[PDB]
Every structure is written in structure tokens, then in C-alpha cells.
């Protein structure tokens with residue numbers, strides 16, 4: 001079929017599975033959240049907490065689905081239908097290395113739900129305690145062994161793909177051991193080989209030799225807030241793509257619809273990026289496409305604390321907070337606008 005509605009499997013949408021309810025988790029996990037002290041506010045701060053009540057959740061927006069559980073199979077079905085609406089073929093699942101049965105259950109539920117809609121799943125490997133290339137190898141082996149035969153497990157030209165958040169916190173001399181074909185614990189040419197996509201943060205002077213010396217297959221930028229880093233400044237994307245092409249690397253710029261995290265970081269207003277009825281998202285997505293990249297990542301499906309979510313949000317005013325909402329747009333606007341941009345992306349692939 002050639003309907004212009006099909007999923008795109010070079011479009012990766014960052015997905016968070018850390019939400020709970022008192023009932024599916026024993027607590028409205030993540031809907032309740034600590035408020036961060038101001039790093040420039042001095043000692044003795046008592047910033048308090050957001051209790052995750054109906055009235056007061058840890059977001060500047062309010063989900064259409066309410067204070068949902070990421071383990072609720074009925075929520076997961078709805079989320080996969082939202083991915084289908086957005087045409088986002090790959091769910092890039094945040095992975096925290098919790099090593100508990102509830103994590104294992106949730107990952108299985110997500111894979112199963114995704115497969116029903118032909119969605120694929122890859123892992124976004126977060127920075128967990130004592131993360132290093134040896135335990136990262138062991139965890140890559142574990143993920144590929146546990147999930148690699150699941151029909152929803154993502155592969156690109158036969159290889160799994162991992163996004164590695166905060167990769168720059170591990171020295172290239174360590175990465176080389178894992179990612180050079182000659183590295184002492186290499187995954188190259190093994191059953192556990194994968195496309196490893198590192199987080200490009202700062203200037204090319206630093207990031208170019210890092211990516212080469214660490215033997216990453218590519219890089220992404222994550223941040224939805226334009227100008228937060230060099231990498232998340234879209235005017236740099238043409239140049240970053242040129243360098244990627246010259247060096248055989250895969251650039252997967254990250255685009256998002258806005259940013260606001262001031263419920264949890266009241267002092268962080270400088271990072272706010274207003275949605276302007278979709279114009280911010282449009283501008284950022286257009287820059288990614290114009291850069292001529294082969295793949296795009298979306299920050300985020302549902303990072304509600306960041307205010308970067310494309311998941312449907314609704315107007316809500318409670319006794320505790322007046323939430324932002326999608327304004328003149330309907331709750332599903334960012335899903336349907338994602339589908340629009342996926343179509344434009346596919347037209348120039």
C-alpha cells in the first residue's frame with residue numbers, strides 16, 4: 001500500500017515507562033516528584049515535593065489519560081494507537097537498569113503491545129550507578145538475549161540499535177574497548193553487535209574526536225529545548241550532518257514540541273521553549289529534515305516533567321495549579337502534526 005499513513009521505521013520516539021498508580025504500583029510513581037533545589041540558591045533550601053494527587057502532578061501539562069500506570073495494559077494499547085497516529089515506527093524505551101521484576105514485566109508488556117501495531121522497540125540506555133563499558137556490555141548481552149527474538153525488537157539492516165545517554169561521561173579509551181573492532185571486549189563481529197548512537201552535547205572541537213575515538217556508529221542530540229547545547233541548536237545540524245556523512249556516522253537529530261520543567265525546577269525558567277500552537281515543533285522538525293538526515297528522534301512521547309511530550313494533554317485547572325495545555329490546538333494535535341512531518345521526512349528520504 002501507498003496511503004501515506006504507514007509507520008516510519010527511521011523515526012524514533014523517546015518513551016518513558018516510569019509512571020505508576022497507587023492501585024496497577026503501590027504509588028502514583030513519577031506523578032509525585034521532588035522539587036529540585038536551585039543550584040545557585042545556597043544551602044538550607046527546603047524545596048518540597050509535588051504529591052502526585054489528582055490536583056497536583058509533576059508536570060506543567062496534564063495528561064488526557066490521567067495519572068496512568070506504565071504497567072497498565074489498557075494504557076499501553078492506547079499508547080500504541082497513538083504511535084500509529086503519529087506514524088512513529090520505533091519506540092525508544094528509556095532503560096534504567098532497575099534489575100527488578102516490575103521492570104522486566106513492563107518491558108515485556110511494552111514489546112507485546114507494540115508488536116500488535118507493528119511498532120518496534122529499541123532501548124535508550126540511561127546512566128545508572130557505576131555504568132562502565134564492562135557492565136554496559138553485559139547489559140547489552142542481557143537485552144539482546146532476553147528480547148532479541150521478540151518480533152517487536154528493532155533492527156536496522158540486521159543490527160540492534162541503542163541510544164546512549166551521557167556517553168561523553170565515559171572516556172573514549174574505555175569506549176574503544178567495547179566499540180572498536182579490535183577492542184578488548186568488543187561487540188563488533190559478535191552476536192551482540194549493535195548500532196551505538198552516542199549523545200553529542202558540546203562543540204565539534206570536542207565531539208568530533210570523541211565520536212571517532214570512541215567508535216560510535218552515530219550520534220543524537222536529545223534535548224527538546226533549542227540552544228540548550230551545541231548539539232540541540234538546529235542551525236548546527238547541516239554542518240553536523242556533513243561531518244557525519246564524511247565520517248560514516250549516522251546522525252539522528254532530536255526534535256521536540258517545546259520544553260518547560262518549572263513545576264519540578266522552579267528556578268529553570270531560562271530553558272522554557274514555548275509551543276506557539278505547534279510553530280516551535282514545525283520549525284525544529286523542518287530543520288532536521290532540511291539537514292538531509294536519514295533518521296530522526298523525537299523528544300518526547302511522554303516526558304511530562306520536561307514538558308516535551310507529544311502525548312495528548314487536556315486543559316485542567318485544579319485548586320492547586322493551573323496547567324498549560326495545547327491552547328488553540330486539540331489534545332491529539334502533536335500526534336497528527338508528527339504524522340505530517342513524518343510524511344515530509346519520507347518524501348525527501
Ligand SMILES: Cc1cc(=O)oc2cc(O[C@H]3O[C@H](CO)[C@@H](O)[C@H](O[C@H]4O[C@H](CO)[C@@H](O)[C@H](O)[C@@H]4O)[C@@H]3O)ccc12
Nearest residue numbers: 094126127165222223224225228259261268271303306
Ligand atoms: C534542563 C533540561 C533541558 C532539556 O532539554 O532536557 C532535559 C532533560 C533532563 O533529563 C531527562 O532526560 C534524561 C535523558 O533521557 C534522563 O536521564 C533524565 O532522567 C534522570 O535524571 C532526572 C534528573 O534530571 C531524574 O529525576 C531521573 O530520575 C533520572 O535519573 C530525564 O528524563 C533534565 C534536564 C533537561
